[PDB]
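Case study.
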Amino acid sequence: ATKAVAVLKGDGPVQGIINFEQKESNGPVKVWGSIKGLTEG
Amino acid sequence: ATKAVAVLKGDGPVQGIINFEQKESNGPVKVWGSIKGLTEG
Amino acid sequence: ATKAVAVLKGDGPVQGIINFEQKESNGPVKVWGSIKGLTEG
Amino acid sequence: ATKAVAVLKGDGPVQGIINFEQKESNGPVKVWGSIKGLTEG
Amino acid sequence: ATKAVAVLKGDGPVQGIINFEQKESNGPVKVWGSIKGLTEG
Amino acid sequence: ATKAVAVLKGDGPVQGIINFEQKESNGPVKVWGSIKGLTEG
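After joint prediction, the assembly is written out as follows.
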C-alpha cells in the first residue's frame, strides 16, 4: 500500500528522522537538529 | 502493506531515527541531534 | 505486512534507533544524540 | 486567576464532564452521552 | 491560581468526570456515558 | 495553587472520576459509564 525509499550519497551528516511513518496516533513529534562545525570536500 | 528502505553511502554521521514506524500510539516523540566538530573528505 | 531494511556504508557513527517499530503503545519516546569531535576521510 | 463553579438542582442525570480545564495539552477529547428511557416530575 | 467547585442537588445519576483538570499533557481523553432506564420524582 | 471541591446530595449513582487532576503526563484516559435499570424518588 505504502512504500518509502531514502538514498543519500553525501558526506554530510544526517540529522533527524528517516522514513518516519507516524499513523493514526496522537503526539507532538519534535525534531531538533544542531551542528556547529565545518566540513570539507 | 508497508515497506521502508534506507540507504546511505556517506562518511557523515547518522543522527536520529531510521525507519521509524510509530503507529496507533500516543507519545510525543522527540529527537535531539547535536554535532560540534569538523569532517573532511 | 511490514518490512524494514537499513543499509549504511559510511564511516560516520550511528546515533539513535534503527528500524524502530513502536506500535499500539503509549510512551514518549525520546532520542538524544550528541557528538563533540572531528572525523576524517 | 481562573475559577469554575457548577450548580445544578435538577432531577435530570448528568452526562459528560464538569469543570473540565484542559490546558496547554494535545489530545482529541471526546465526550459521548446516550440516555434511552423516560423521566418524570 | 485555579479553583473548581461542583455542586449538585439532584436525584439524577452522575456520568463522567467531575473537576477534571488535565494540564500540560498529551492524551485523547474519552468519556462514554450510557443509561437505559427510567427515573421518577 | 489549585483547589477542587465536589458536593452531591442526590440519590443518583456516581459513575466516573471525581476531582481528577492529571498533570504533565501522557496517557489516553478513558472513562466508561453504563447503567441499565430504574431509579425512584
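Observations recorded in class. The interface with chain B takes residues 26-28 of chain F (CB under 8 Å). The longest strand of chain F covers residues 2-8. We will return to this complex in the next lecture.
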